[PDB]
Symmetry: C3
Subunit: 445 residues, 3 copies
């Protein structure tokens, strides 16, 4: 007999995300190794190294091992606990009721001690049920950490490429600006220009030059995040992170059925497991409303004289059946039961919150990614127009048919447009990461 | 007697906030349902729904129940703990003292077991005092969560309106810029224009177009945050969140006496409660320096033969008065007492820190709100001048009395001014939230 | 005898930071009171007030005392625990074995009760070894908090000066802009200007005016962070924070040998101590594979009649030697051992992660600081050219040889350049803080014979 509530997984409705029945997405398959679709061998090597080197991941494997070991101890409580012991009780004094003389008093015991709770109401079955569930929670915590780590690492590689891309855009615009500064000097020196043109050109050149070490600095913080995520020291990175293009995915994104997301996400499973364990804990406490039946035992040797221990004349056995019940202390048992009920309500609510946070993450990731595609189309147009404008403004300044401010302003806009477009490409890549993170991709799924 | 210190709430001086004798503020009343002053029924519905749906709030209620359950168990220790038992000791072997033959031996007991610590030094009174205080702390944690949740939600609604406001500003500027692009093409096509004007107009149009999906993306993240704060899935959100104006409060802000803030804030009460509990815990530990006086009992039946249990010939009673005192183990008792004293100093320091954090939050909220009002006055002036400038620049460009860059730049400034003004209005709304959060507004007892 | 693994500090290689062999840095000495290099008495007073008033620091000191007190209780388990008792047993009923009559029964005891676990396999020595290490971890947590707090406070002072600097730049640019607005009005009113010029001038003035209360607002948030970090209420600040220059260090930075950073960082020591404690806990669990030997005792008086307690005829004593061993419960003991092994692997990995996070912080702080110096050189050039451009554009606008946009744009760029430069100066100062934070500056490593 196993008292208290029988846990049932909640009847959690599947995710509905309408925005996913469109062209950017392929619901017909899900790609578990979602980062491989970027077709970037360097990224793939980063991820592989991270799975064997990351120290947080190592901690989580260890915690999983700890939880199994806890469970394994609790499972032995289903059986009698048979220990060994050699003891004595030696003294001199009165023996009240028997005599008022001070007599010597000796007793020796050697053998097996047995302690056994008969699990008639399932206190122990429930403890094991809880511990098994906490083991499964720990496995899910590990899987979630893997999902989180892969996403963080892929994202950081993106940021690194972004900084590299933007540095290259900044240096390229710096050269255009150097050419222009040089033209303002030439015109001024030939008597058909102005110091005012050279000054403004210098100021703009220095502004653009100032962005370079900023961008390099962000690249270096990203390289350094990557090294830690790999379990590697900053100066000991194995993998060559020299500049390459920001990866892209041109096929529609294999996102599977978004209805499956709540079943795929390990954080959801972890919190469901904790709910199951907490529900079993109600059982544990509920069992204390009923009597506790135990059976102690001794098998070995008992004697008044040490010499006899081990011999036939000292053979002994004893059996200690016991039934106890809280009786007038039932109020206390009820208080602990209320406590366990409260903890299980906490766990339920906490599970529900994770479900909601997960649906929120996915809804954001999909809404973002679609908008980021739209935005990019406009930014690409801005860049094209800007490049063309600055080209023409350069020709006109050179020829004497437009003021320097026209060229200055067109150059500012070209840089500003090309930079924003790159940032937006990085955003798109990061949005891909957020989608897969939110779907629970990357643990074996 | 009740040993150890008698807790007294610290004499914490009232908050002094001088900036509040200004006319932005009404110290003559405080409005508990502070969000209702925005006169936004949609906001009011959100708040009411969140109080019944939010899952973090559910967790906190459950933790409150857990703490009451702990307290209820402790309270029973003021009374004797009277449990029930049926036991036996059955076996064969020597009986030291009595005989060296291996004899059969039986003993049966059935009745009530009684255990009572008498509480002469108040160890138990103090345990209960601590537990009651931790219950009040848990109630205050819940109330603080209510304050935090309401503030987060109101703030998020503000962000949502902000994104919607800014989208509308971006679309309105997009129309002006579309008209301009069209004018540059027209003038070019009519032989009094230039390709360079069309290109720059295209670039600027695309830039403005690009901002729209960004702002929509932010609107969607805010919609989704609102749904979770309500305890709802994103696609189930009941409330119509289609655009409306960012709410405003035109009367002076009813902020009450700022010297009441520390009494109103539940976080301060929670930390004060934990301090009270920790002070009682010093009492608990201090009691262990004194003797512990207890009284055990048995009432029921005892017999050498199973047959007799229940009969008057097996009636039994016993009574076990006992006094113990740590004696040579006083060093251990002292170490635990030092430990409890240390924990109480931690709690005191931690209470003081919450006081300081609260005064910091308050002082920031008031400093900010005044500055945000000032800043807005300038931004409103900037917007007006900018719109006028761009209107006139458009007239002049069309007429042939100013270059396109003059119109371009005036259009950029109009958008930049109108968007900054909107952001600043959002800031002002959020400043209102920060004031009320910091004053401890919005909780139920 | 002491059982289970004998802890050894891991053989952690020294930090390698190559970028530190260059001339921004002086590796020949380290300054532990690293903020004093700024030669700012106001900053020095803030830091001193913080060390005596900050409440987080007080919390952490208290937690350190709690952990020592826990350890002191555990230490007494190496010795017999000798308590005292006065008790009685009174009742009426059968005495199984002896009689089936219901007899009256009385008994009185007064004396010393003794309990002693003899630490033959070191279960207790190991518990103490763990507890001592957890105390050292708490000491190191406190020291790390001190490092973090000092850094936070110095950083905040920098942000405060930054806000004050930028306000001053904004007001100064506001004055230039007022002069220009006045010129647009004059030219318009004298028949050779344009309303369009006055309107754009007005818009820009309002933009610049709008920045002032924002910057003042940041100054006030900073003042308030500083007050809490000092343990002070916002309106009760002891130190005068009225505007002064952002401090600067002209000497190359005394950063010592970066290969001594992992030894100096308290967070690294804290994690190493938790590793040591965890390793000792393996010992504790390993001891349960062996027998446990105990010895109980009683010495005092026992009697059937209350009157006799205290007299020679009621003298009593007993001794309770005992040895137990898990026997068929060894699988449970093994499960606990595997558990403790798992926790020690967790702790090792956690120690290693802290090492890596520390190397990452250090490497970022040095990469940043170098880059921030370079960036500043360019921003200074931008400011100079911009100031000059705006002067010339003003001359040309006055002449009737440009539209006002030329002057407007030059003025925007001047403000934008001077503001960016100031932010970048603040960045450099904050990068100094990040270096010292990451090196473990601001606590006293050689205090307490070190260990
Ligand atoms: C008056 C004389 C009485 C004689 C009684 C027999 C003595 C018991 O002596 C016993 O001998 C064993 C080996 O033989 C040992 O293993 C036991 O531990 C020992 O105590
Ligand atoms: C208060 C915690 C630290 C004090 C350590 C010394 C013991 C203090 O114990 C004191 O002695 C008396 C006992 O009857 C009582 O009257 C006091 O109220 C009690 O607290
Ligand atoms: C009333 C009968 C009890 C016998 C005397 C009690 C001994 C109390 O003595 C205690 O021993 C502690 C640790 O060993 C010492 O540190 C304390 O100074 C002392 O309080
Ligand atoms: C683990 C050894 C027991 C140590 C108790 C030592 C108490 C002193 O702790 C000290 O406090 C200061 C701030 O409060 C820190 O700067 C010191 O570095 C720290 O050692
Ligand atoms: C809920 O109360 C269920 C109680 C179940 C008791 C189960 C006992 C199983 C042992 C079966 C052995 C049969 C003969 C073998 C003798 C050792
Ligand atoms: C759970 O208790 C519900 C009641 C119905 C289940 C029946 C199980 C019968 C068990 C009898 C146990 C007595 C054993 C005592 C040995 C010392
Ligand atoms: C100091 O001397 C304390 C004063 C209070 C009396 C102390 C004795 C125990 C009080 C517990 C209250 C309920 C006990 C009822 C017994 C059935
Ligand atoms: C391992 O088997 C332990 C052997 C137990 C023998 C008893 C030792 C008597 C105590 C010596 C005192 C030394 C003090 C050092 C304190 C760290
Ligand atoms: C310290 O002195 C080392 C003692 C040497 C060991 C012998 C003690 C016998 C007790 C039985 C322990 C069995 C361990 C089982 C593990 C697989
Ligand atoms: Na109780
Ligand atoms: Ni020390
Ligand atoms: Xe044994
Ligand atoms: Xe330029
Ligand atoms: Xe930088
Ligand atoms: Xe047994
Ligand atoms: Xe411009
Ligand atoms: Xe019972
Ligand atoms: Xe019984
Ligand atoms: Xe029994
Ligand atoms: Xe809420
Ligand atoms: Xe435009
Ligand atoms: Xe976007
Ligand atoms: Xe005593
Ligand atoms: Xe500090
Ligand atoms: Xe201006
Ligand atoms: Xe502001
Ligand atoms: Xe700050
Ligand atoms: Xe012993």
């Amino acid at each position: 007999c196993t008292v208290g509530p029988d846990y049932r997984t909640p009847d959690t409705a599947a995710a509905k995300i309408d925005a996913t029945a469109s062209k950017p997405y392929d619901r017909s398959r899900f790609e578990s190794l979602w980062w491989k679709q970027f077709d970037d061998p360097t990224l793939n090597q980063l991820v592989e190294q991270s799975l064997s080197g990351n120290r947080d991941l190592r901690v989580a494997f260890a915690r999983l091992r700890a939880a199994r070991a806890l469970r394994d101890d609790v499972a032995n409580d289903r059986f009698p606990v048979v220990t060994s012991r050699a003891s004595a009780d030696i003294g001199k004094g009165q023996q009240p009721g028997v005599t008022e003389d001070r007599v010597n008093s000796e007793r020796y015991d050697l053998g097996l001690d047995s302690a056994w709770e008969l699990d008639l109401f399932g206190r122990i079955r429930r403890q094991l049920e809880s511990s098994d569930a906490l083991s499964e929670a720990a496995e899910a915590d590990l899987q979630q950490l893997q999902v989180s780590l892969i996403a963080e690492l892929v994202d950081a590689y993106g940021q690194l490429r972004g900084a590299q891309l933007r540095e290259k855009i900044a240096l390229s615009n710096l050269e255009n600006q150097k050419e222009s500064r040089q033209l303002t000097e030439q015109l001024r020196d030939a008597g058909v220009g102005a110091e005012l043109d050279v000054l403004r050109a210098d100021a703009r050149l220095a502004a653009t030059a100032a962005s370079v070490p900023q961008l390099q600095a962000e690249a270096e913080r990203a390289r350094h995040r990557i090294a830690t995520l790999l379990g590697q020291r900053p100066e000991e990175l194995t993998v060559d992170l020299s500049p390459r293009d920001l990866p892209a995915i041109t096929k529609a994104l294999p996102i599977g059925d978004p209805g499956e997301l709540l079943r795929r996400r390990p954080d959801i499973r972890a919190a469901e497991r904790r709910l199951a364990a907490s529900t079993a804990d109600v059982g544990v406490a509920t069992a204390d409303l009923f009597p506790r039946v135990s059976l102690s035992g001794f098998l070995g040797f008992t004697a008044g004289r040490g010499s006899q221990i081990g011999s036939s004349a000292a053979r002994a056995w004893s059996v200690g059946p016991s039934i106890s019940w809280a009786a007038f202390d039932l109020g206390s048992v009820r208080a602990r039961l209320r406590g366990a009920k409260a903890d299980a309500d906490a766990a339920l609510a906490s599970y529900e919150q994770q479900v909601l946070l997960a649906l929120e993450e996915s809804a954001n990731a999909f809404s973002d990614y679609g908008k980021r595609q739209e935005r990019l189309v406009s930014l690409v147009r801005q860049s094209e127009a800007s490049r063309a404008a600055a080209q023409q403004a350069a020709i006109r300044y050179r020829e004497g048919t437009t003021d320097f401010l026209v060229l200055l302003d067109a150059e500012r806009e070209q840089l500003s447009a090309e930079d924003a477009q790159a940032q937006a490409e990085v955003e798109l890549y990061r949005g891909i990461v957020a989608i897969y993170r939110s779907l629970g991709g990357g643990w074996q799924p």
